Paper text:
However, amongst these remodelers, the INO80 chromatin remodeler appears largely sufficient to generate the well positioned +1 and −1 nucleosomes. S.c INO80 is a multi-subunit complex consisting of 15 subunits that are divided into three different modules.
To test whether the reorientation of the Arp8 module was dependent on the species of histones used, we performed biochemical and structural studies of INO80 on nucleosomes containing S.c histones assembled on the 601-nucleosome positioning sequence (S.c nucleosomes) with either 80 or 40 bp of flanking DNA. We found that the remodeling rates of nucleosomes containing all S.c histones were within 2-fold of remodeling rates containing S.c H2A, H2B, H3 and X.l H4. Therefore, for all experiments except those in Fig. S6, we used X.l H4 instead of S.c H4 to make S.c nucleosomes as generating large amounts of X.l H4 is technically feasible. Shortening the flanking DNA from 80 to 40 bp for S.c nucleosomes reduced the remodeling rate of INO80 by ~100-fold. Two distinct classes were identified in this dataset for 0/40 S.c nucleosomes, with the grappler region of Arp5 adopting either a crossed or parallel conformation. These conformations have also been observed for INO80 bound to 0/80 nucleosomes, but the functional consequence of these conformations has not been identified. In comparison, for the INO80: S.c 0/80 (ADP/BeFx) and INO80: X.l 0/80 (ADP/BeFx) datasets, a much smaller proportion of particles fell in classes 1a and 1b. It is further informative that, for the INO80: S.c 0/40 (ADP/BeFx) and INO80: X.l 0/40 (ADP/BeFx) complexes, only a small proportion of particles have either clear or partial density for the Arp8 module on the flanking DNA. Our structures with 0/40 nucleosomes suggest that the Arp8 module sequesters the HSA away from flanking DNA thereby inhibiting its ability to bind flanking DNA.
Author numbering:
A (entry chain R): 434 to 506, 532 to 570, 584 to 588
B (entry chain S): 112 to 162
C (entry chain B), D (entry chain F): 25 to 103
E (entry chain A), F (entry chain E): 38 to 134
G (entry chain G): 13 to 120
H (entry chain C): 66 to 121
I (entry chain H): 36 to 128
The structure:
Amino acid sequence: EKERVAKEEEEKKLKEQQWRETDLNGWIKDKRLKLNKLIKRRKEKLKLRDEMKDRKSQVSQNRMKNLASLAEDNDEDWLIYTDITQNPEAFEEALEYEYKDIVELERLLLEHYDWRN
Amino acid sequence: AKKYCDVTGLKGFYKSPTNNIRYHNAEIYQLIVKPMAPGVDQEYLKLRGAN
Amino acid sequence: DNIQGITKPAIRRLARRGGVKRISGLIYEETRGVLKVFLENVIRDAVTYTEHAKRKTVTAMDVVYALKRQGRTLYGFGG
Amino acid sequence: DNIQGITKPAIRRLARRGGVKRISGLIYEETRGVLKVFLENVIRDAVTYTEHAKRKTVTAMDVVYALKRQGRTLYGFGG
Amino acid sequence: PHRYKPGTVALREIRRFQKSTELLIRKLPFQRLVREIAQDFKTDLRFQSSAIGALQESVEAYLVSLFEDTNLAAIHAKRVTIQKKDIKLARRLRGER
Amino acid sequence: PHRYKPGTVALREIRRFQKSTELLIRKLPFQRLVREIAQDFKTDLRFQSSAIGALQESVEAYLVSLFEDTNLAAIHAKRVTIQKKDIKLARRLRGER
Amino acid sequence: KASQSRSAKAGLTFPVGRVHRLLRRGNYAQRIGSGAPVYLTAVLEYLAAEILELAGNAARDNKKTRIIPRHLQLAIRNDDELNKLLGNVTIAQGGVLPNIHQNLLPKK
Amino acid sequence: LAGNAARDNKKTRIIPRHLQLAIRNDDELNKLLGNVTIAQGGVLPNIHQNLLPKKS
Amino acid sequence: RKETYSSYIYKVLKQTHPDTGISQKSMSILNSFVNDIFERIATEASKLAAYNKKSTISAREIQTAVRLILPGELAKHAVSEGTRAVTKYSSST
DNA sequence: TGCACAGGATGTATATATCTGACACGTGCCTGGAGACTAGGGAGTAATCCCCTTGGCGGTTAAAACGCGGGGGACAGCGCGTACGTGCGTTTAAGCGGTGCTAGAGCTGTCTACGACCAATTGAGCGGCCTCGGCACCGGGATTCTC
DNA sequence: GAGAATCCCGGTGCCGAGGCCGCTCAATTGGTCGTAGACAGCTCTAGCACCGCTTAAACGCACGTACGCGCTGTCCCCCGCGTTTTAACCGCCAAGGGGATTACTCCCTAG
């Protein structure tokens, strides 16, 4: 099972190498678009993480209302109670994984904030 | 008397309502004025004698 | 039947207030034991505040001061 | 690199004071993260006592009073 | 008929008890217990109902906090059912011996 | 070709440090650490010599008091080796969060 | 000649003079300065106002018009600096916040 | 108590390790000072039975 | 004759929530809370004044006690409110 | 034998009508906070002395970093049984609530003797200085777990 | 059965732990007065005791099934040990900056 997955990964790497050797500009554009999408998703996640720290924000009021509704009360309700938990360390791990994915997209683009203002 | 920003010395348009420190624009407020250590606001106000 | 004046589902009620799932049968007398070693430390301090005050009844005041002592303070009855 | 001042055989020395036969390798940085919050929590209440004393040096007199305020009153250096 | 999985209606009972704010110990066995436990230190001792409520609220908070401490020590020990050594560990690591 | 069993000399040096009571923490790196952690609030800080010794004794006592607790958590976990999860449960049961 | 109290001189609704009385014959110090009850009164103002804000939002969150001690308990325990300040005090008739461990759920 | 803890370890001088030995053995004194850290006293030697190796 | 804070805190609630009612037990909890906070702050200030060999309690030792007791952002908001109140009161000229 | 239609039964919908039920506002009152006047002593300023502590030397040396062989300890996995959850029959003694009785909480009055306050006094406990032996340190031989 | 690794007995400065005198404030004694603690005496709230109806909660027996527990095979990651090397520590000299303290003063807080 692991050997078949390794052979599939090697075949995918060979297909990516053949696509880079055949159409380098199209693969570079696709990898740049993927890097831009990953950067936009990471920026949205960072904006959400910054907005969650504010106690007077409307997201904090919505979290308080969700906690009051969960106290007020189903598989969906149990899933919402599981997903309404605080996960700062998991947020940092997800940010690290998103940074690793963005670095992989940047490496795929390579293979295929300023101080003025 | 003319009003100046306490951090940079430029033209101070605004003034924070918490520690009464004048600032120039948003980046100064976000980086310097709001997350400032306690006791430094009085030393800033010591320069123009407003402590 | 005084120390077992509390009943078998009473520890169950205090258990399911605590978010537990499965409960054994040998823990009921042990929870009653920590009841004994908690209420000795509470009402010995309460009766010291009682007969210091030249009274032979406990009021609402000495009990919450006894609770104020060890750091397990309780509101609502402070007046 | 100054945060690398505390050394791993010193953490081993502290561990064998506790009497532990087997130490895994992550315990060192775990105790580092534990201790870093911990000493800063008394540096919090030492330098404000120093500042209210109109002093710019710390001593053995305010640090023992900071520990006595939080709740680990320590003997040996007065107080 | 239709039954329930053991451990699913117990979730409903858990959420019912963690919504409901009511008192979980009957007042007369508790007042008998505190009267016969106050008789040892001093005789002819009368009581107050507000003192009864304060005492019962204190011990109810104490079993509650001790009980999630025991539950956390139990799931720490890769189990679901709690036992007596979980209680002894919770008391020893909480500081009261 | 005399090779000791692993853990026997660990227990022997555990015994030697059980009669021992001296400081197990180097002085100058800890002085550097407390200066770099105290510089962040009001600079140009003078320090007395006895304050560093008091800080040494308090950090060593807190370390050994946490380590006995996590030893009890580990021996309750049916293991000999400690982990981060024992340290978190020790911090949870002692209550410093 | 007639002038009003120091509370509206400082713009506060809590009694400055009563706090001064309690600081005087509370035997904390043999001499009490003038500005101490004003500062202490303002601190109690902000603490009571913030607690009443969280209680009012909790009572709005349950669609009621009265302050139940459940609202006070959930407002104190939900918020984290009020958790650290009020960790060792048990609120009379407060209850317990709902929490289930993730491994205790029917994960399947 | 410190004098007895001095004579059982052959010394005529009081050291803080002897003071720690004198406070920790008496249980009522121990919970009297359950929140007190001593300086240069050490900890009592306790070795766990599961951590003790071999058999008999 | 007995003392309570009830009218003041009632007014504080009417300033922000006009249509909200009150349980008497809630006043008992909140009266105990404000008395307990006044208790810890006042003896922290007295302890600090006894430390500095001073016989006088002023605004600065209770400022340091507020910095000692309260968490950091509550400490900074509390000293902001206290400083603006004491500077408003000190402008009796 | 099954299905469709018709008739009866019942739910309900929304404004009533009585009709309590627990809340927020309009008058006394009394006592304690505020204004005004006096005193004295507690921070406040500041200068000066001296002491310790922050850098900077340098040697040297226990001790940490690093790499390497090996061995039990933690990891998941699988089976055996029983203990806790579920359920219905059968108590029982909690809860309400009602009444009767009386201790004891609580307020007031009055007194006088314990204690703050003040002035004089004498002695004893802090401190600089002086002197010497307990213990750590070092050297070398007996002795005990471990392999 | 051997071997590191201990415990145990004897010589060595030493430097840090007991006396001792000088003496300076701080404990001691006496007198005065004005109030607070103690006791007596008083009025009613509130705590204890018991009877009786209702019934929802609690005990007890029966069984069924997940879950606590016993065993097992295995990576493998911690543990003992040799080899650099790198910073910790001890001896010390000098500065100067910061704490202690004296000394008058006035204002603001007690009454």
